[PDB]
Amino acid sequence: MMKKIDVKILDPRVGKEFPLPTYATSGSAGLDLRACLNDAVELAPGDTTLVPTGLAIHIADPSLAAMMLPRSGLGHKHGIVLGNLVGLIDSDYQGQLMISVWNRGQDSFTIQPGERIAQMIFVPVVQAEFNLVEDF
Template sequence: MTAAPFAVEVKIIDPRIRDWGMPSYQTEGSAAIDLFACIDAPMEIAAQAPAVLIPSGLAFYMGDNACAALVMPRSGLGHKKGLVMGNNVGLIDADYTGQVFISAWNRNPPGTDAIRIEPGERIAQLMFVPVLRATLNEVEDFSDSTERGAGGFGSTGAGAKPV
């Protein structure tokens, strides 16, 4: 099953994007587009230093409040080098039309090498997702129950009865 294309307007804020190539899906099955580090010179992020905001050089207009975008680390950079998002996942609301920034953090232990980021390096990815906006209806008791109920952290793990 292939999802229907969803048109999103993109504004190029940093003209170097045209030289590096517009972000695109790298494979037929890719769920997200890569974002570039639009920095003027190489930068280093020390291990465990505070997260830094790196401009992506792009702004988006989704045109539909039932859509949002998520900024996430590129899996290879996170796993192999330790570069992750300073806020875990960045949420871009449909009504935000300013430049997207990437919150980058070096999760490696103190004393390890800094992570070097080059201008134009693909350092994050952006995934467009549907948004469900719920109407909250206050109740005294829920209209139905589940087997799990209020069982929280670890309630389905070790020691839980199989279904």
């Protein structure tokens, strides 16, 4: 229920110090993304930080998009979610996948190099052709 998606590695630690993203089970809908950091980053309550993944994708098919969402436990239990809430990746975006991380909780939290911090899903998207009407 695949679609081949081209991926390029931007940081030499990817696949060496921490693995490439993989589906945990065959019924899994998302892939976990990990923090490609040189040093751990401490987020006080309310802070946001942009975390690199060391990866770039090229979806290429305009009928597909990817969405980045918070990991469920981390968001619910530690208040570690995305600063833009939900990240949308277009079929033509070819830059590095960067994760906006926001501490919406009451406690400081430290992101460690290689920690899984977000999940990404691939969903079909439709481009609307607007038909202007004066009344429905």
